[PDB]
Amino acid sequence: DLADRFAELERRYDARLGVYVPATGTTAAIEYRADERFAFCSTFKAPLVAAVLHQNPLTHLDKLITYTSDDIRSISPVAQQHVQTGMTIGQLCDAAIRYSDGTAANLLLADLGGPGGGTAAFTGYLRSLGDTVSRLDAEEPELNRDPPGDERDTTTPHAIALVLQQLVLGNALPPDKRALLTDWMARNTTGAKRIRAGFPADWKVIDKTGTGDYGRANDIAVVWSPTGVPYVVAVMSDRAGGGYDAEPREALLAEAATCVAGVLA
Numbered sequence: 001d002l003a004d005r006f007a008e009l010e011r012r013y014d015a016r017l018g019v020y021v022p023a024t025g026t027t028a029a030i031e032y033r034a035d036e037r038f039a040f041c042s043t044f045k046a047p048l049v050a051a052v053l054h055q056n057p058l059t060h061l062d063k064l065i066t067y068t069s070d071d072i073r074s075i076s077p078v079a080q081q082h083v084q085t086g087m088t089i090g091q092l093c094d095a096a097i098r099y100s101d102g103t104a105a106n107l108l109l110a111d112l113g114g115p116g117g118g119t120a121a122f123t124g125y126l127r128s129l130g131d132t133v134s135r136l137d138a139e140e141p142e143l144n145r146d147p148p149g150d151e152r153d154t155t156t157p158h159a160i161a162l163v164l165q166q167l168v169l170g171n172a173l174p175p176d177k178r179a180l181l182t183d184w185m186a187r188n189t190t191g192a193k194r195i196r197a198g199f200p201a202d203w204k205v206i207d208k209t210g211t212g213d214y215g216r217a218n219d220i221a222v223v224w225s226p227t228g229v230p231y232v233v234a235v236m237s238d239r240a241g242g243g244y245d246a247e248p249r250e251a252l253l254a255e256a257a258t259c260v261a262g263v264l265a
């Protein structure tokens with residue numbers, strides 16, 4: 001019945017909702033518009049941090065990266081505090097995941113592929129995981145403002161969730177790097193009202209958020225049953241009918257999350 005519950009959500013919130021849960025040994029795949037393109041928004045910061053972890057040794061995460069106040073062209077709650085000072089790569093990692101800091105992500109794009117090569121390098125990291133579908137094509141903020149229908153800066157719930165299944169559950173990162181990426185997203189400061197609200201408290205929840213123009217509201221998460229069996233959950237939405245400044249419905253995502261919680265009991 002999952003499909004019906006989802007379209008009611010869509011009806012009640014007046015939004016496009018894509019859901020994908022990868023199949024486990026015990027359960028089937030929960031998919032809904034899973035292969036339609038949704039904007040990354042800030043969810044690209046999770047597999048980006050992983051790309052930075054993977055290309056470099058952990059020795060890299062203690063390299064002070066310098067930047068200016070005129071480098072803060074997006075929401076940047078942490079990079080705010082180091083106008084000139086600058087931060088360790090590990091610090092920007094921490095800022096781009098848990099705090100969704102935009103300047104953080106841009107310096108990590110730069111670190112990953114040069115001033116005009118980071119978005120393609122980030123996309124190539126995704127291809128190296130078998131995502132031939134998602135593309136990053138801009139830096140912050142403009143990656144949040146691509147018009148609806150455009151393929152730029154889009155992923156799909158199916159492809160990001162498979163990327164996420166690799167990063168946390170598969171061997172895309174080695175135990176250590178993999179472990180730092182899991183603490184970072186398990187501390188995320190931005191995902192209370194999203195998937196976390198949708199899952200029972202005795203279920204573990206680790207997530208990274210995305211929010212943008214046209215009502216875009218996203219949450220990609222790895223979730224753990226009290227038995228400790230792991231699930232990957234991507235929830236992506238937008239409300240593009242309402243224009244660029246339409247209001248994202250976070251409760252939408254929580255609502256989507258309670259349904260997948262329901263067949264995963």
Ligand SMILES: CO/N=C(\C(=O)N[C@@H]1C(=O)N2C(C(=O)O)=C(CSc3nc(=O)c(=O)[nH]n3C)CS[C@H]12)c1csc(N)n1
Binds near residue numbers: 211
């Ligand atoms: C051009 O940039 N525009 C953005 C944007 O930067 N999106 C990013 C994204 O995905 N972000 C996330 C997050 O990680 O979810 C958020 C979380 S939303 C939020 N959390 C708070 O704690 C709070 O006090 N206020 N807000 C709004 C901030 S913007 C950034 C945006 C946000 S809503 C909208 N229409 N545009």
